């Protein structure tokens, strides 16, 4: 008699010791509904089609309609043929302080966007599909959750894994913040100034695609900063105490925090910003880098010893990873095995499970 009767013959590197971190897909619940077979994921308790083709089939592909002829259709309208209303002859950008008359429906739609960030994202924001092109973005569950937390909490710290598409959500969040709030100065901080310029560029792209009624008039449009007619702005900087002390930000966004050398002095300088009577917002996102400064920030948040709300999302947040090479749902069994085998458990734990190398 070899291994017992009812013991699965498939093993996974992640279950390297008595601890089952990933359950075999054959043990999951299954059901038939809507004419197809479904399997329940162990990661979120949600149902997924057995076939990747159906997973793709069930997603809506809607292009961002190009409408520059019918104002009545204000939701998709952008007056780019009339370069008089344009900024620097730019067809996608709206000109500042331009007197415009609105209808009742337009005011309500604008308010709806101001108060429902998720609705704003999936109705007026996009991503570039490989073959379909520029279409409206359908947020991943973690992106929807992240957007909601960043908007509802004054300070948020996100411990994320790599390649989750987080820049897309950050861009939408910043675009939303400056478009629906007045006189708010936003500062983007990163290890290198070039990194912050990239975040700013992604945010500029989102604003550019917005219809006339949602897009604020453009006052300034540089590679290092922008200013809108509502008085809000965004600037890209290299993290340092001087960058923090040198401006009065309503919001500071820090990119890849755990990989910023000597961040401690920047963190120190941010304490007065946090405790200021102006109630500034602070958003931090990063993947782990051992037991350094970020580990301390994260731990305080998780233990409730700071004003920061913690948020985390790991590798299984990207659902395409839950289908194998034969386009069959396997809850990420194969993807994780190949990723670990192609690197190592240590690298996978840090890079994809958001674990802190600096062991407990």
Ligand X SMILES: Nc1ncnc2c1ncn2[C@@H]1O[C@H](COP(=O)(O)OP(=O)(O)O)[C@@H](O)[C@H]1O
Q: Does 161 interact with ligand X (rule: CB under 6 A)? A: no
Among 139, 158, 206, 337, indicate the residue that binds ligand X (CB under 6 A): 139
Nearer to ligand X among residue 53 and residue 163 (C-beta):
163
Q: How far is CA 231 from CA 118, 180, 196, in A?
A: 24, 11, 21
Q: Does 190 interact with ligand X (rule: CB under 6 A)? A: no
For residue 283, the minimal CB distance to ligand X (Å) is: 15
For residue 202, the minimal CB distance to ligand X (Å) is: 7
Give the DSSP H/E element, type plus range, for residue 142: helix 141-152
Residue 163 main-chain phi, psi, to 5 deg: 50, 55
Q: Does 163 interact with ligand X (rule: CB under 6 A)? A: yes
Cα gap 306→54, rounded to integer Å: 44
CB 308 within 8 A of CB 155: yes
**Those residues with Cβ within 8 angstroms of residue 255's Cβ, 6 or more apart along the chain or in another chain:** 170, 188, 189, 190, 195, 196, 199, 285, 286
Among 41, 123, 143, 287, indicate the residue that binds ligand X (CB under 6 A): 143
Among the residue ranges 105-113, 157-165, 179-187, 213-221, the one whose residues contact ligand X (CB under 6 A): 157-165
Q: Does 205 interact with ligand X (rule: CB under 6 A)? A: no
How crowded is residue 308: how many other Cβ atoms within 10 Å of its Cβ?
22
Residues binding ligand X: number (CB under 6 A):
13
Among the residue ranges 139-147, 230-238, 302-310, 328-336, the one whose residues contact ligand X (CB under 6 A): 139-147
Nearer to ligand X among residue 106 and residue 318 (C-beta):
318
For residue 229, the minimal CB distance to ligand X (Å) is: 28
Query: Strand, coil or helix: what is 343?
Result: coil
For residue 84, the minimal CB distance to ligand X (Å) is: 34
Q: How far is CA 131 from CA 58, 127, 128, 261, 329, in A?
A: 17, 12, 9, 40, 23
Q: Does 167 interact with ligand X (rule: CB under 6 A)? A: yes
Among the residue ranges 166-174, 208-216, 236-244, 274-282, the one whose residues contact ligand X (CB under 6 A): 166-174
Q: What is the CA radius of gyration of the chain?
A: 23
Nearer to ligand X among residue 167 and residue 299 (C-beta):
167
Q: Does 127 interact with ligand X (rule: CB under 6 A)? A: yes
Q: Does 321 interact with ligand X (rule: CB under 6 A)? A: no
Q: How far is CA 336 from CA 237, 339, 349, in A?
A: 36, 5, 11
Among the residue ranges 41-49, 87-95, 161-169, 259-267, the one whose residues contact ligand X (CB under 6 A): 161-169
Residue 55 main-chain phi, psi, to 5 deg: -60, -45
Chain positions contacting ligand X, by CB under 6 A:
127-128, 137-140, 143, 163-168
């Amino acid at each position: 008699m070899e291994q017992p009767i009812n013991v699965l013959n498939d093993f996974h590197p992640l279950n390297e010791a008595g601890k089952i971190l990933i359950k075999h897909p054959s043990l999951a619940e299954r059901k038939d509904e809507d004419g197809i077979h479904w399997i329940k994921s162990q990661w979120d308790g949600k149902w997924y089609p057995e076939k990747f083709s159906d997973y793709l089939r069930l997603h809506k592909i809607v292009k961002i309609p190009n409408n520059s002829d019918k104002p009545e259709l204000f939701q998709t309208y952008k007056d780019k043929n009339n370069k008089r209303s344009r900024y620097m002859g730019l067809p996608n950008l709206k000109r500042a302080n331009i007197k415009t008359q609105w209808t009742r429906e337009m005011v309500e739609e604008w308010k709806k966007c101001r108060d429902d960030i998720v609705y704003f994202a999936e109705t007026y924001c996009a991503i570039t599909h490989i073959d379909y092109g520029v279409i409206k973005v359908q947020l991943r569950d973690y992106q929807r959750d992240m957007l909601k937390i960043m908007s509802s909490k004054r300070m948020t710290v996100c411990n994320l894994s790599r390649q989750l598409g987080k820049t897309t959500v950050v861009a939408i969040f910043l675009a939303h913040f400056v478009c629906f709030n007045k006189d708010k100065a936003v500062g983007i901080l990163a290890h290198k100034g070039s990194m912050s310029a990239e975040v700013l560029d992604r945010t500029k792209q989102a604003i550019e695609l917005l219809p006339d009624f949602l897009q604020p008039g453009i006052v300034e449009w540089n590679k290092g900063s922008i200013e809108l007619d509502n008085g809000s702005s965004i600037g890209a900087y290299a993290s340092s105490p001087d960058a923090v002390r040198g401006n009065s930000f309503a919001m500071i966004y820090i990119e890849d925090c755990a990989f910023i050398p000597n961040f401690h002095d920047s963190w120190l300088a941010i304490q007065p910003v946090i405790s200021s009577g102006r109630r500034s917002k602070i958003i931090i996102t990063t993947t782990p880098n051992g037991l350094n400064h970020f580990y301390d920030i994260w731990t305080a948040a998780v233990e409730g010893k700071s004003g920061f709300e913690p948020y985390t999302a790991i590798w299984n947040s990207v659902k395409e990873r839950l289908y194998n090479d034969e386009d069959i749902f396997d809850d990420g069994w194969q993807w994780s095995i190949q990723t670990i085998n192609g690197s190592s458990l240590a690298q996978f734990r840090q890079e994809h499970t958001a674990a802190f190398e600096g062991t407990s």
